[PDB]
Structure 1
Amino acid sequence: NRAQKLLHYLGHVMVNGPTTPIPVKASPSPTDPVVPAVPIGPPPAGFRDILLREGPEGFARAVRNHPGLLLMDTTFRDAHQSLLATRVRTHDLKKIAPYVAHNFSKLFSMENWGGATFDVAMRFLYECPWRRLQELRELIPNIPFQMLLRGANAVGYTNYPDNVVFKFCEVAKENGMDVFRVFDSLNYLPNMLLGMEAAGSAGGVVEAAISYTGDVADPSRTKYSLQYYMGLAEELVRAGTHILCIKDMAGLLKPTACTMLVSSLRDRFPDLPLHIHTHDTSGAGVAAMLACAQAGADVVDVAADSMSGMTSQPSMGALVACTRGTPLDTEVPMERVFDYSEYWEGARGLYAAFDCTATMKSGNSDVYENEIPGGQYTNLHFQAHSMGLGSKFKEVKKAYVEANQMLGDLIKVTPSSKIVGDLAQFMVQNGLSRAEAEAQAEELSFPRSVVEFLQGYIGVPHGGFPEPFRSKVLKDLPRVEGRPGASLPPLDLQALEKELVDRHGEEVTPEDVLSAAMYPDVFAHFKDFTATFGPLDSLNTRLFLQGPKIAEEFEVELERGKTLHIKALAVSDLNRAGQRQVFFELNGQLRSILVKDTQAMKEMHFHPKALKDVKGQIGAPMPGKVIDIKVVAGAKVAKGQPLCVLSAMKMETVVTSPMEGTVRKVHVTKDMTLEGDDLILEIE
């Protein structure tokens, strides 16, 4: 019995408009993407059976001894985050999940879990990550899944207590999550050791990712030399990981740097599998990927053709065709590739409301001097749009270079990238250059994020903080060193459950408790809106965004037990009250409800009205202009004396003092239109 709340949502969409902020105006494609047919038989068993049967190390050995190359479709997380603002719901994903299970059993592993998946499922979109994860894992019983995880902060942006992160990892593994990736913003050794230890405590296949920046083929700059990365890999390997992984956030891999680094690591690690992640922002990613594959790569990240290019991962087809005659022999059907690409482009056509292709058309070479992370460009563009700064977005990216170089050649990863982007925003809205910021570091009101980083909440940069700027900014601000996760006191996991179940909700589960501990207020708002509108996510994307149209019929699956349909009838009209009626016809009955519009009165005039109950109160006898008032406020007047004169074209009503006393205040000064019984002055 939530159809009432759902229709209230629909009517609120009809009147007040779509609720989620929209960066650019657009209209959804009326057409519906076509899903290809799927075989009746259960999906063929992929590599998940090995994990279910063999240990994580046994699985790693089986992959390593396998001849050929292993593939990852990263469309579900990295493309959505990068190309879009990853505002995709799970309905369309489920529409294709059986096809993927039935056809893509040769894939290495699947990425479905994001870092900002919680933020999008809470703040703007309204979904529970655990739920649709559960349905997807049901639909995919035979491909292992990979989730994104950071070093100290599990999904947050500040370092976090060890115990809560361990419990969260335990919960995720208990749910059925398969493969874990753990990394750090600056590759901070205590944080990465903590993450590796947490993943080992969870139990499963564990990898660590090395943040690659710059070019290792340039001997002029050895800020992070091949020796540096090699030693880093040395402590990672001695840490006992399953597989090493490499992530190219900005797609800055030359095939030369590819081959020399891959050889440099494979020579001393002959049985170590390889995982490669890159963003095809510059359009030359495919060459580097092919060079790595020739050089001894094992697993790589690559996106569907329709969702490829631009800033996402490269395409299926390029690598598939390039290795047909090549002994690499990716050995995957092209028909499934075409079906996947066509379905994905059809689905993208629906999310045309905020495609960044209007802003940026094709990937440029402006990454080698800008180093914008591939995954956050559209999101930061939309952040600027919310800030209204989209007009100068061309200068916004111009500021990023110096925003980073304020703090030096840092490892610009998602937290650091966000901080640098915030710094660029601040100095571009203030419009001051490098010298103005550096000389006035104390003077400028930097956000709490600047002092947060300079304090050392995330960690310590390998190169170290900028001492003069940090001294100018922090000054009296405390500086906590060491591992902040070790520095941060542990926090309770129990009394918060009681507090939340007292405030709302009358059931106990650890999932919502840990979610609210990670993020209380957005959790509360999400619960508020869901309660006011019942279950969601059972609708179509077009229905979710723009709502039903006039005299069109559409079936709505309320839940699995029953499915009904609603017929939108008419918009009715604005009432004198802010409520508006809207007409709706469900399966066999007609109904209409009241919708509040955001146009409640315009509040003009409301001139003071003299009250006749108080005989001392004076009201204007006739409406018109005032030629003059013979009395100033706080002046004594006598009974029957002229004190004010009203004006019209034929009569001149001279005001008479109602009694003896002094005038408090003259509401009318001179020459304003008056009404009958208007407050002029009060006499006592």
Structure 2
Amino acid sequence: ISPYFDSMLVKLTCRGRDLPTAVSRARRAIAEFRIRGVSTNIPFLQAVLDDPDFRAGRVTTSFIDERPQLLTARASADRGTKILNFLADVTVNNPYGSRPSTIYPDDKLPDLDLRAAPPAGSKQRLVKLGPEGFARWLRESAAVGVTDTTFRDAHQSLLATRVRTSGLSRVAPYLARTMPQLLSVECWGGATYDVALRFLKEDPWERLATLRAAMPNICLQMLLRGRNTVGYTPYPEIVTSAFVQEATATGIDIFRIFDALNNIESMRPAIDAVRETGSAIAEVAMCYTGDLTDPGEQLYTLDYYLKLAEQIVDAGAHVLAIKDMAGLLRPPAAQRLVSALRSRFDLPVHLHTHDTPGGQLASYVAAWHAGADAVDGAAAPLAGTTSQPALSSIVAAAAHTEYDTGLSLSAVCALEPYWEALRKVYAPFESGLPGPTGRVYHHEIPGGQLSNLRQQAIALGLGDRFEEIEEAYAGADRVLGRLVKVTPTSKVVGDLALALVGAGVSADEFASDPARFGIPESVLGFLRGELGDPPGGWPEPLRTAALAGRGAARPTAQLAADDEIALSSVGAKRQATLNRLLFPSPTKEFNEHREAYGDTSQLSANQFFYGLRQGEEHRVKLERGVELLIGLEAISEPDERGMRTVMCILNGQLRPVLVRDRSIA
């Protein structure tokens, strides 16, 4: 466009037998016309052509007196241009270097008729009998229910929780139609909420809805953490109740509730909120640490767990579970504990463990031989190391026995190549260990944290020797007196080992001069006592008097009345209000990104992370019957500025896009 003359683009003339026919034809003409690159006055003309007075013919010099003809807005809501902008930006400014040939996991999916309705499963039974009947049925059933943790707890410990929704949604129908006997599926909660809001620019509720629609016959399970639902700090009761209500409304069937330091009055409100629903199941978990079968174990003994379980049963628990996060449960400990729990009480038992030392399936085999009703399993390509035991092993260990699960083994084996291809795609985010480590018996650390610890010690100094971090974690654990850590109290000890190794404190002189250090604020917040009380007791008869004379504790502001108003109604407003109230900064970034670049959650991992290559054609689904075909043609070298022009193809039409190359500045 030349900024010297008038702004005339095209004259359109329409004719007809009568005025209404000419007006309809002009409307069609102006709708079909498409101009992209500059701002156009088409919407004003469309508003003028759609005026009933104008169609009736009451034209007058003062026809413009009506105000809302001008600011009709709603210019184009153009999604293709924003998708193309984002794709070009990713292609030009891709941080990852060169790459092998592109891998397409979708080609590895087995053939199956995705037209027939899937057979009834656990959701039908839960609807028919309810929570109490479901629990009784599970207690009285000789089979051992398998739970799948590939969707949440597999890529969390191996791929930094960076698997998007496309692959899960693509593979869910096959799981629902070849395996209609799985007790439940864990696909929500934990750290997926924060990572989805922050690193992947996605909305977790849309993911939950998509997974619900994908699988209608299998129950869904979510890992709640007591007062702190998905965050890292206590939250008010109303927020927790609203969150439980929204989650059960979207389709969360089972809630697994645990706490860092095992104590009641930190999980009672969540249990009451679950029980108020009347259609959900509550599974209360007790955290396992130490080795009770040892003669010298004077703190974590059988009686401690027995009274814990008695309190949990007094609190109104529907399922009782044992949580092993480091892999410290041995066959004999498991046998005795399961036997005692099954003989004292009348509740089903759920067992969960990690495979860090190797060969933890033996524990499962010792548990279901004594009363255990259900176990957990991760898929074989994403199993082992710091993940959960393989599903094929679990199915094959009970075949042709009275404990048969009933799951076809060929069906479970048929889905492995897709998981292999998906793991091959997520190469830059690989964080798995070389193999099994014996040392975990001395420096017990949850499997989900060890990978990030290895990366942190690679990238933040001492990387050739990793021992110092191990005995520093041991020393920090011994200083505070045998803490029970999973998520909350794991990071405080990690930061304390970090400071200890960075300050030259060998093992014990930190307890001599605490006031002469830069103790991380999470540690002071632990010492303040907002996470509860330690099981063994306060480790500070000489550590600190009250806080070592630091200061005071920060206040908390009361919720604003409008938030309480919006929390009472069910809808997208409540979901947005929860997103903003839980993680403000990343949800604000996500809102800005979604305004800028529309909706990009439908893209694949390859397009999202790498970009566009020449010779390949991509299909992106916008709506039912609305699909976009995107390709690349060529790229020009940058001019005297940092600006380049990329020629792409959209629906078989050439499109130039101007992009900024941040490499040359």
**Whole-Å separation in 1 of the counterparts to 2:634 and 2:145:** 55
Quickly say closer, same or farther: Cα 1:465–1:492, change in 2 above 3 A.
Answer: farther
Q: 2:559 aligns with which of 491, 497, 512?
A: 491
Amino acid at match of 1:157: Y
Is residue 2:376 matched to residue 1:301?
A: yes
| Cα distance in 1 for residues equivalent to 2:502 and 2:623 | 48
1:193 aligns with 2:268: yes
1:547 aligns with one of 588, 592, 611:
611
Corresponding residue number in structure 1 for 2:592:
528
Equivalent of residue 560 in structure 1, options 602, 624, 629: 624
Alignment match of 2:151 (pick from 76, 83, 97): 76
1:377 equivalent to 2:454? Answer no
> Per-residue CA shift, 1:467-511, capped at 9, x if unaligned?
13343854243479xxxxxx977523625999xxxxxxxx96110
Cα deviation, 1:272-300, whole Å, max 9, x if unaligned, reads 21100000111121111100011111011
1:580 aligns with 2:644: yes
What residue identity is the alignment partner of 2:257? V
Q: Which moved more, 1:57-66 or 1:7-16?
A: 7-16
Q: CA deviation at 1:390?
A: 5.3
Task: Supply the distance in 1 between the matched residues of 2:534 and 2:579 (Cα, whole angstroms).
Answer: 29
Question: In the alignment, is the contact (CA less than 8 A) between 2:283 and 2:318 conserved in 1?
Answer: yes
Alpha-carbon shift at residue 462 of structure 1 (Å): 1.9
* 1:227 maps to 2:303: yes
Distance 1:64 1:351, change over 3 A: same
Structure 2 residue 225 is the aligned partner of structure 1 residue 150: yes
- For residues 50 and 381 of structure 1, the distance between their equivalents in structure 2, rounded to whole angstroms, comes to 44
Choose which of 114, 126, 131 in structure 2 pairs with 1:56. 131
Name the structure 1 match of 2:543.
469
Contact 1:162 1:490 (C-alpha < 8 Å) held by counterparts: no
2:338 paired residue among 246, 262, 275? 262
Tell me, yes or no, if structure 1 residue 591 matches structure 2 residue 591: no
User: C-alpha deviations, 1:386-428, integer Å up to 9, x for none?
Assistant: 6566565554344221222232200011111111112122222
Separation of aligned partners in 2, 1:29 and 1:419: 43
Cα distance in structure 1, aligned partners of 2:285 and 2:605 = 35
Give the number of aligned pairs.
Answer: 579
Q: Which amino acid aligns with 1:140?
A: M
2:492 paired with 1:415: no
Equivalent residue in structure 2 for 1:240, among 302, 316, 323: 316
Partner residue in 1 for 2:20: none
* TM-score (norm. length: structure 2): 0.83
- 1:395-410 matches, cutoff 5 A: 395-410=468-483
Cα–Cα, structure 1 residues 590 and 387, in superposed 2: closer, same or farther, change >3 Å? farther
SS of the aligned residue for 2:88 comes to: helix
Deviations 1:507-553 (A, max 9, x none): 96110111110111111111112211111121111111111113322
User: Post-superposition shift, 1:466?
Assistant: 2.6
Three-state SS of the structure 2 residue aligned to 1:367 is: helix
Distance 1:104 1:61 in 2: 23
Residue number among 197, 214, 236 corresponding to 2:290 in the alignment: 214
Q: What is the rounded CA distance, in whole Å, between the counterparts of 2:231 and 2:545 in structure 1?
A: 27
> Bigger shift: 189-198 or 298-307?
189-198
Alignment correspondent of 2:168 = 93
Q: Deviations over 1:134-164 (max 9, x none)?
A: 0110111111111000111011111111111
Aligned partner of 1:292 in structure 2 is: 367
User: How far apart, CA to CA, are the structure 2 residues paired with 1:493 and 1:418?
Assistant: 34
Match in the other structure for 1:361: 434
- For 2:161, give the aligned amino acid: T
Q: Is the 8 A contact 2:194 2:583 kept in 1?
A: no
SS of the equivalent of 1:471 reads coil
Contact 2:472/2:507 (8 A) holds in 1: no
Question: 1 CA distance for matches of 2:641 and 2:572?
Answer: 42
C-alpha distance 109-67 of structure 1, shift in aligned 2 (>3 A):
same
SS at match of 1:306: helix
RMSD: 2.3
Matches of 1:457 and 1:372, distance apart in 2: 23
Contact 1:151–1:195 (CA under 8 A) maintained in structure 2: yes
Q: Deviations over 1:293-331 (max 9, x none)?
A: 111110111111221111111112222222223321122
2:98 and 2:468 mapped to 1: Cα distance? 25
Q: 1: CA distance between counterparts of 2:231 and 2:101?
A: 35
- Indicate the residue corresponding to 1:177 in structure 2: 252
SS in 2 for 1:469: coil
Which residue, out of 37, 54, 57, partners 2:111? 37
Change (3 A) 1:570 1:438: farther
| Counterpart contact for 2:327–2:355, Cα < 8 Å | yes
Residue matched to 2:92: 15
Q: Does 1:428 align with 2:505?
A: no
1:314 corresponds to: 389
Question: Is 2:137 aligned against 1:137?
Answer: no
- Asked whether the equivalents of residues 291 and 300 of structure 2 are also in contact (C-alpha less than 8 Å), the reply is no
> Normalized against structure 1, the TM-score is what?
0.81
Q: 1:553 to 1:26 in 2, by over 3 A?
A: closer
One-letter amino acid of the counterpart of residue 152, structure 1: R
Out of 246, 252, 266, the residue aligned to residue 328 of structure 2 is 252
The answer as to whether partners of 2:146 and 2:182 remain within 8 angstroms in 1 is: yes
Moved more, 586-595 or 459-468: 459-468
Q: Secondary structure at the match of 2:307?
A: helix
- SS in structure 1 of the partner of residue 417 of structure 2: helix
Tell me which of 430, 447, 457 is aligned to 2:520: 447
SS at match of 2:618: strand
Q: Gaps (5+ residues) in structure 2? A: 1-77
Give the C-alpha shift of residue 260 in structure 1.
Answer: 0.6
Q: Which runs of 5+ in 1 are unaligned?
A: 481-486, 499-506, 602-684
Return closer, same or farther for 1:99/1:121 CA change in 2, 3 Å cut-off. same
